[PDB]
């Protein structure tokens, strides 16, 4: 036996509206922001060291200028997660993204683990100072071409993203240890689960916990070359479901099953109208 009555989006929907599903964790990757016009900086079709950065900041900040999104308009997928929040279902959103769209969509700091950090804030890098600066400040420096320095001590100011050489934020490990004792459903969206330790999260779910992947391609299966993992398609499969396609399409399909399609359309068009109007 198993919590899902069938291993399909329809079975997940039925589970989510049952008394067994109280607490959803979303795991999200670059797949959820590509339809917002932000390309996945790993993807080859699209176009890093901390020690290097601290001595020669100029290239990172040049590259930052080049890749700075033209607008910050979250996706159907982002507002889907806001909808989980409004309906009391969202325990946490673990994101690999640095684009701040989760926050613009109305996820709060408490709801979020920015596993790879974020551009939302920046800090002076001097240990004895660590002055915090907002994105508005950082954006002005990136666009005005001026290499960002601290007003208090003149040290370099670095966006709060995780560079190679740096460890993931402490919050990632401390939330992981608690959240995955509490989870009823993992929603994995727009990630190929290629980056560690983020990808190890799927193995932290309780054995019974259904795991729904919404992604352009099947991901998370065990590597036949090395080796738990996602099992979608064997006779042993009992809880993992793959919905292949664009993340916005998959969340729309799931909202529709849930009876949330009108709420999600209304939320999205309202928030898009607001962002468009400046
Ligand atoms: C608010 C905002 C600003 C910018 C520039 N972008 C974005 S969202 C897009 C983005 O991928 N920008 C990047 N800037 C520098 C990058 C290189 C890199 C360095 C260190 C670690 C990983 C990658 S990747 N949002
Ligand atoms: Zn400083």
Numbering used by the authors: 56 to 102, 119 to 298, 305 to 355
Sentences from the paper on this structure:
NAD+-dependent protein deacylases (sirtuins) constitute a unique class of enzymes that are conserved from bacteria to humans. The human isotype Sirtuin 2 (Sirt2) deacetylates both nuclear and cytoplasmatic proteins and thereby functions as a major cell cycle regulator, a determinant of myelination, a regulator of autophagy and a suppressor of brain inflammation.
In the course of the investigation SirReal-mediated inhibition, we also determined the crystal structure of another aminothiazole, termed SirReal1 (2), in complex with Sirt2 and a different acetyl-lysine peptide substrate. The latter is derived from ornithine transcarbamoylase (OTC, structure termed Sirt2–SirReal1–OTC). SirReal1 has a benzyl instead of a naphthylmethyl substituent on the aminothiazole and is 26-fold less potent than SirReal2 in the same in vitro assay, but it retains high Sirt2 selectivity and shows similar behaviour in thermal stability assays. SirReal1 also locks Sirt2 in the open conformation and shows an almost identical interaction pattern as observed for SirReal2. In the Sirt2 complex with SirReal1, the acetyl-lysine-binding mode is different. The acetyl-lysine adopts an almost physiological position, as it is observed in the above-mentioned ternary sirtuin complexes. However, even in case of SirReal1, the benzyl moiety of SirReal1 shifts the acetyl-lysine of the OTC peptide towards His187, weakening the formation of the hydrogen bond between the Nε–H of the acetyl-lysine and the backbone carbonyl-O of the conserved valine (distance between carbonyl-O of valine and Nε-KAc: 3.2 Å in Sirt2–SirReal1–OTC, 2.5–2.7 Å in ternary complexes). SirReal2 is partially non-competitive and SirReal1 is competitive towards NAD+.
